[PDB]
């Protein structure tokens, strides 16, 4: 809906109730996509999709739209798939334990090798963040990853 509204699809869409509810906006945008697919080539439609939908992922994280519930669990199943026994959560660094705003750093050691580390307000949150960081590193979605390729092959 954001893409269509900024591309002025809403103004060109013939429909009652000028607000054009989001199902109607999505339907009109994907009808435009299908018309492009029918008129031009599949490669051109893929280029249009990459230019106008993948650019909305710029700067976003993975869990921000994945919204998983058990990061440590999914990490241990992923390690089982990758033939890794089990990660051990160990407190690496901390600053204040009796203060109102403690900060903790929890790292994950597989075979006594640090694979990831995470900060948190409490130890449980730090461990969850460490599991999330390990999961992102395993899946390759990292802040230092390759930026998306925007070129003409």
């Amino acid at each position: 809906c954001h893409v269509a509204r900024n591309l002025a699809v809403e103004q060109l869409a013939l429909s009652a109730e000028f607000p054009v509810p989001p199902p109607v906006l999505r339907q009109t945008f994907f009808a435009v996509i299908g018309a492009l697919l029918q008129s031009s080539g599949p490669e051109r439609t893929a280029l249009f999709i990459r230019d106008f939908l993948i650019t909305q992922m710029t700067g976003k994280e993975l869990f921000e739209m994945w919204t998983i519930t058990n990061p440590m669990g999914l990490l241990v199943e992923e390690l089982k798939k990758r033939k890794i026994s089990a990660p051990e959560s160990r407190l690496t660094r901390q600053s204040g334990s009796t203060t109102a705003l403690p900060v903790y750093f929890v790292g994950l050691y597989c075979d006594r090798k640090l694979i990831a580390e995470g900060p948190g307000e409490t130890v449980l949150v730090a461990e969850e963040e460490a599991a999330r960081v390990a999961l992102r590193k395993l899946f390759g979605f990292t802040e230092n990853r390759r930026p998306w390729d925007y070129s003409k092959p």
Binding site: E61, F63, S95, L101, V103, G120, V133, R136, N144
Partner: peptide, 18 residues
Amino acid sequence: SSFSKAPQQWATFARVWY
């Protein structure tokens, strides 16, 4: 490096006892 926004903020602006 690849931390979420809130834990990254907490790590950056955490208080330290010397």
